[PDB]
Amino acid sequence: KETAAAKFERQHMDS
Amino acid sequence: NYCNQMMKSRNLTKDRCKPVNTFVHESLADVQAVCSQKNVACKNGQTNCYQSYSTMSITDCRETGSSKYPNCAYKTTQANKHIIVACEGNPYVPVHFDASV
């Protein structure tokens, strides 16, 4: 599934 | 608004209304870099947390009091603050957003 680091990205990153 | 749209797009409110969420407007490498900056304790009392030396552009999304699924509603608050993240793994990268000061 989606790793914790990948989830952090989908949820908080908006460069 | 931005929060309602971004929360939907990122699969955060498609199956429920997430109370709060923060979006950082910096490059992914610049945020990953925080994991080697100021070490601090996490709320829970852990110590794998780090505070950024500088402030970053962030957008806070807060659910209105009247919000209820499927009609989720968000209050958008733009700001510049120091972020605090919890890091783990190899490479050592952020896995949790602790807060913004």
From Swiss-Prot, chain B:
Q: According to its UniProt record, where is this protein located?
A: Secreted
EC number(s) of the enzyme?
4.6.1.18
**Binding-site positions, substrate:** K18, P19, V20, N21, T22, K43, R62
Residues annotated as glycosylated are N11, K14, K18
Active-site residues, record numbering mapped to chain? H96
Enzyme class, one word? lyase
Oligomeric state and partners?
Answer: Interacts with and forms tight 1:1 complexes with RNH1. Dimerization of two such complexes may occur. Interaction with RNH1 inhibits this protein. Monomer.
What is the protein name stated in its UniProt record?
Ribonuclease pancreatic
Can you name the source organism? Bos taurus
Query: Which classification does the entry list for the species?
Result: Eukaryota, Metazoa, Chordata, Craniata, Vertebrata
Q: Which residues of the full protein are shown?
A: 50 to 150 of 150
